[PDB]
Design a binder for this molecule. Structure first.
Ligand SMILES: CC(C)CCC[C@@H](C)CCC[C@@H](C)CCC[C@@H](C)CCOC[C@@H](CO)OCC[C@H](C)CCC[C@H](C)CCC[C@H](C)CCCC(C)C
Ligand SMILES: CC(C)CCC[C@@H](C)CCC[C@@H](C)CCC[C@@H](C)CCOC[C@@H](CO)OCC[C@H](C)CCC[C@H](C)CCC[C@H](C)CCCC(C)C
Ligand SMILES: CC(C)CCC[C@@H](C)CCC[C@@H](C)CCC[C@@H](C)CCOC[C@@H](CO)OCC[C@H](C)CCC[C@H](C)CCC[C@H](C)CCCC(C)C
Ligand SMILES: CC(C)CCC[C@@H](C)CCC[C@@H](C)CCC[C@@H](C)CCOC[C@@H](CO)OCC[C@H](C)CCC[C@H](C)CCC[C@H](C)CCCC(C)C
Ligand SMILES: CC(C)CCC[C@@H](C)CCC[C@@H](C)CCC[C@@H](C)CCOC[C@@H](CO)OCC[C@H](C)CCC[C@H](C)CCC[C@H](C)CCCC(C)C
Ligand SMILES: CC(C)CCC[C@@H](C)CCC[C@@H](C)CCC[C@@H](C)CCOC[C@@H](CO)OCC[C@H](C)CCC[C@H](C)CCC[C@H](C)CCCC(C)C
Ligand SMILES: *C/C=C(C)/C=C/C=C(C)/C=C/C1=C(C)CCCC1(C)C
Ligand SMILES: *C/C=C(C)/C=C/C=C(C)/C=C/C1=C(C)CCCC1(C)C
Ligand SMILES: *C/C=C(C)/C=C/C=C(C)/C=C/C1=C(C)CCCC1(C)C
Ligand SMILES: CCCCCCCCCCCCCCC
Ligand SMILES: CCCCCCCCCCCCCCC
Ligand SMILES: CCCCCCCCCCCCCCC
Ligand SMILES: CCCCCCCCCCCCCC
Ligand SMILES: CCCCCCCCCCCCCC
Ligand SMILES: CCCCCCCCCCCCCC
Ligand SMILES: CCCCCCCCCCCCC
Ligand SMILES: CCCCCCCCCCCCC
Ligand SMILES: CCCCCCCCCCCCC
Ligand SMILES: CCCCCCCCCCC
Ligand SMILES: CCCCCCCCCCC
Ligand SMILES: CCCCCCCCCCC
Ligand SMILES: CCCCCCCCCCC
Ligand SMILES: CCCCCCCCCC
Ligand SMILES: CCCCCCCCCC
Ligand SMILES: CCCCCCCCCC
Ligand SMILES: CCCCCCCCC
Ligand SMILES: CCCCCCCCC
Ligand SMILES: CCCCCCCCC
Ligand SMILES: CCCCCCCC
Ligand SMILES: CCCCCCCC
Ligand SMILES: CCCCCCCC
Ligand SMILES: CCCCCCCC
Ligand SMILES: CCCCCCCC
Ligand SMILES: CCCCCCCC
Ligand SMILES: CCCCCCCC
Ligand SMILES: CCCCCCCC
Ligand SMILES: CCCCCCCC
Lengths: 231, 231, 231
């Protein structure tokens, strides 16, 4: 395990996701409100899935070698397995907060699936120049998602409770900033142009992942917006 | 890319799915009705997914070699990845049109999953005679789906709005004819008996795919059946 | 096929799932009640999926070799493909019976996904001692599911119809006993410590699978709890 310099960040990531999972699990024990239960379920599952995939990367299972540029390049494929399930759960948290219509939710989840799926294909593609074609398609799917979060959701939040409108606005802003960093790190890291070494890349993704999951969850689950308006 | 004679049909397929995706995306921009949004979301996602998988076939990612009959046989596995997601979306379009009950929808999607999954296993099976066992099981799942579309849905459409009944009937008929061709092409093509060469097989699937997705979508999204009855 | 001593149990399993599938399919033909249709759909799909995966194991497709302990160890990976889809369907049968809230259903299905997914990783892991780390995480996800079935569902059933409360209690008890045997068989069988040989392991899983699917389904589909209260 320690044979890879990036192991320290995989281990820290595993620990922080594990701790985040346990914290949300305990916190949600005292919850009976049916609406709050939905948000706790979604939000606890996110770091639990990430915990398993960080562990698989730490132990070496979630790593494969991909030939491109005349080299055997270490590619952590387990990231995409994580993201396939956790990024639509994160979007679902946002969509339920603002009572999004079903068509909009399906558009978001579908675009998200395309985003992660094409990122996976790009990560595993052996023809170097083609990796960036997949990156571009994935990034276009991301831009669609960000567009919807701003010009379909923000003006939906404003007709809702003030506490859900303010909580949505904060989580929207956190999401757009954090999620936009992922394609940049991929592009300059070992999957793309290879300018930033894998150990630093792994650190960067770990900070983004913990912030986008445990950070996000801490903000959401401390808000009164997750509860039905009750006396 | 041009090293494979079937590349021209993969390229045309990619282009037509891409163009179809953009057309539906633009067309649905001016839509606020919650019901119509569902149909636009579902129907736009279908060629978008197909676009990505056609591209993966064009670039060579979605192709593998399978030993059977003492030969290395080129198998485009990306078709099944496409179909796994797009065929239940197509069925969902039909089921929502007639306000199908939840049990019926689950039966359809489940049978569809079995249909595509067993087709994939058959496509990748190395014992030649066993490929046709999987083809038979998949075809039985197809026949179940077609049965339900006729003797569970058609008489559901007739108690609904005339515009939804007439639109459903047309899309049902398009679906049954087009979908029934797929097992025949598989059986006589490079996956099955090998009587029709891969380049012609690829052409045939491209015509079926564009018709079943973009053709289907053009009929559906031009109907007033996708809108709630409103003043 | 007969080259593997466990083939007889794979063949019997295939037959019993096939027969169970046909029986439930015929039985549900005379059903119009929308609630009952849901239970028939879910419950018929379960042995149908299991039939396909038992067949893939019989024909040899669903088997791979995994190096650990200095040996090539036969691992039937198709079990996890089965279980990935059938165990959440089984939980859905239980959850719908007691009209579980959406948050609880998502927690169950999510924990179940983690349970099966980590079992799959453990089954395919090449470092022997690490296989048991994945077994432990999977078992913890199982224990969560069993906890919810007892201390979240049982007291939900009691405020419902007596026929649904009594049917739920029986199916809950069947589920907890049968499902708890699976991690034990894995641990002592060819995936784990290797004390029980593969042919006996295969027998054990076949008895558990038929009981947990066809047995379970026979109890559920003969109950009046699956019908809406109607005059
Ligand atoms: C009911 O609605 C609220 C339940 O949501 C909360 C439900 C949770 C989503 C349940 C899912 C967590 C499972 C219990 C997962 C089990 C293994 C976990 C990964 C635990 C890992 C952390 C520990 C090992 C440090
Ligand atoms: C509604 C939304 C969910 C829409 C989803 C959007 C989605 C369509 C976007 C594209 C997804 C698609 C790229 C998934 C591809 C998975 C694939 C990378 C798995 C690895 O297999 C690739 C090659 C080795 O590189 O296998 C070597 C050759 C092997 C023989 C491969 C044969 C097995 C195939 C992988 C079977 C395909 C199954 C499905 C792709 C399962 C989807 C997995 C998940 C990653 C989407
Ligand atoms: C809101 O409900 C309506 C939105 O549906 C319409 C929503 C669409 C389903 C959004 C999904 C499309 C994504 C934007 C996919 C991005 C890449 C596409 C494959 C674009 C490819 C076509 C172009 C490259 C020729
Ligand atoms: C409700 C509905 C959805 C019901 C669904 C119906 C469904 C049950 C029908 C059968 C689906 C099942 C056949 C999927 C099999 C996928 C498999 C072909 C992927 C390729 O792996 C096959 C061999 C190489 O040929 O791998 C070589 C050996 C490797 C070590 C394989 C180990 C990895 C396994 C593939 C893990 C299994 C994961 C699940 C099958 C994911 C499902 C993928 C999708 C195609 C259904
Ligand atoms: C409508 O709601 C009730 C339908 O549920 C019942 C619907 C069923 C879930 C339909 C799914 C079964 C498909 C017809 C599967 C076809 C192949 C089967 C595996 C048949 C195998 C058994 C036989 C070959 C012995
Ligand atoms: C809401 C709930 C559903 C939550 C779900 C919980 C879930 C997160 C729990 C963990 C699931 C995760 C372990 C699935 C891993 C599948 C993996 C074993 C498939 C086989 O690939 C493993 C190695 C060979 O051993 O591939 C060799 C290297 C290859 C290059 C691998 C590259 C292809 C990757 C497999 C692509 C990943 C796609 C997704 C994992 C699809 C999920 C399949 C299913 C088994 C969950
Ligand atoms: C918890 C993990 C999260 C929130 C991950 C988010 C990841 C993305 C938004 C990834 C986006 C990518 C692209 C837009 C193109 C390049 C490849 C990706 C997959 C890194
Ligand atoms: C957009 C793509 C569509 C509508 C594809 C439909 C495909 C089928 C109905 C495929 C059916 C098959 C069988 C019935 C058995 C042989 C294998 C298949 C998968 C080709
Ligand atoms: C129809 C099949 C059923 C009901 C299978 C149930 C399987 C399980 C509950 C498996 C549990 C496992 C663990 C808890 C850890 C070890 C690995 C598994 C996957 C066997
Ligand atoms: C969105 C953030 C992307 C920028 C990442 C900056 C990383 C700077 C680290 C120094 C680069 C290491 C190069 C020498 C090894
Ligand atoms: C459902 C349509 C299946 C029939 C396809 C007919 C294809 C005819 C093309 C000629 C066959 C090529 C054989 C000589 C290369
Ligand atoms: C939950 C049941 C697990 C116990 C399984 C008992 C199997 C006993 C069979 C005898 C073991 C075979 C060892 C000699 C080959
Ligand atoms: C490819 C995996 C996509 C599914 C991820 C799980 C999250 C799905 C959330 C469903 C949202 C509800 C839509 C109506
Ligand atoms: C194996 C992939 C199956 C899922 C495909 C996505 C479409 C699912 C549509 C869900 C229909 C709603 C059922 C209640
Ligand atoms: C990884 C596969 C998980 C999906 C299995 C299919 C069963 C899903 C049942 C959905 C229950 C409804 C939740 C709201
Ligand atoms: C186009 C929608 C406006 C809100 C999205 C902001 C786009 C940020 C760009 C992210 C950088 C990705 C490379
Ligand atoms: C049995 C249901 C009647 C409607 C379905 C028509 C079946 C068409 C056969 C398709 C050919 C597949 C090989
Ligand atoms: C902790 C919840 C109480 C009900 C679950 C009973 C646990 C049975 C243990 C199963 C054995 C697995 C190794
Ligand atoms: C070796 C790099 C070749 C450049 C490929 C860039 C493709 C980016 C596509 C953006 C439309
Ligand atoms: C393919 C990228 C699309 C980003 C711009 C959004 C187009 C308008 C969509 C309106 C729902
Ligand atoms: C080499 C071909 C052997 C014939 C197999 C046909 C099987 C079809 C099954 C239909 C019930
Ligand atoms: C070779 C076996 C080494 C023992 C591993 C047991 C790990 C079990 C983890 C339970 C917390
Ligand atoms: C509760 C702490 C969980 C941390 C387990 C994984 C950390 C890796 C240590 C090497
Ligand atoms: C908008 C046109 C999209 C076409 C891109 C793929 C066509 C392949 C050209 C070689
Ligand atoms: C209807 C009987 C189904 C049995 C088919 C599979 C049994 C395997 C026989 C070798
Ligand atoms: C993006 C950083 C999130 C910070 C989380 C802090 C949570 C405290 C309530
Ligand atoms: C099956 C062929 C479909 C033809 C689509 C034409 C759409 C015009 C409205
Ligand atoms: C766990 C054993 C189940 C027994 C099923 C018998 C069904 C008869 C109604
Ligand atoms: C990591 C366990 C958290 C302890 C409880 C925190 C207050 C709910
Ligand atoms: C008003 C919300 C500001 C949140 C910005 C957080 C940036 C990481
Ligand atoms: C809305 C601001 C987006 C900031 C992008 C930051 C990418 C590192
Ligand atoms: C391909 C872009 C379509 C242009 C608009 C067509 C009329 C909505
Ligand atoms: C009355 C509907 C006829 C549609 C037939 C289309 C055949 C491709
Ligand atoms: C309902 C008519 C079906 C026609 C099947 C055509 C197969 C090529
Ligand atoms: C296996 C076929 C079952 C025959 C009908 C049983 C009574 C519904
Ligand atoms: C009162 C229900 C008892 C069911 C026990 C079944 C054990 C297999
Ligand atoms: C509730 C009793 C569980 C029995 C476990 C049996 C495991 C073989």
């Amino acid at each position: 395990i320690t044979g890879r310099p990036e192991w320290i960040w995989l281990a820290l990531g595993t620990a922080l996701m594990g701790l985040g999972t346990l914290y949300f699990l305990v916190k949600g024990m005292g919850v009976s409100d049916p609406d709050a239960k939905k948000f706790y379920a979604i939000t606890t599952l996110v770091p639990a899935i990430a915990f398993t995939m960080y562990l698989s990367m730490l132990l070496g299972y979630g790593l494969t070698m991909v030939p491109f540029g005349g080299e055997q390049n270490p590619i952590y494929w387990a990231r995409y397995a994580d993201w396939l399930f956790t990024t639509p759960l994160l979007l679902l948290d946002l969509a339920l907060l603002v009572d999004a219509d079903q068509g909009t939710i399906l558009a978001l989840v579908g675009a998200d699936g395309i985003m992660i799926g094409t990122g996976l294909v790009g990560a595993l593609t052996k023809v170097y120049s083609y990796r960036f074609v997949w990156w571009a398609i994935s990034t276009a799917a991301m831009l669609y998602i960000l567009y919807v979060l701003f010009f379909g959701f923000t003006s939906k939040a404003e007709s809702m409770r003030p506490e859900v409108a303010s909580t949505f606005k904060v989580l929207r802003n956190v999401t757009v900033v954090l999620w936009s960093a992922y394609p940049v790190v991929w592009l300059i890291g070992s999957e793309g142009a290879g300018i930033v070494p894998l150990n630093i890349e792994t650190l960067l993704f770990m900070v983004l992942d913990v912030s986008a999951k445990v950070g996000f969850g801490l903000i959401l689950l401390r808000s009164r917006a997750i509860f039905g308006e009750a006396e």
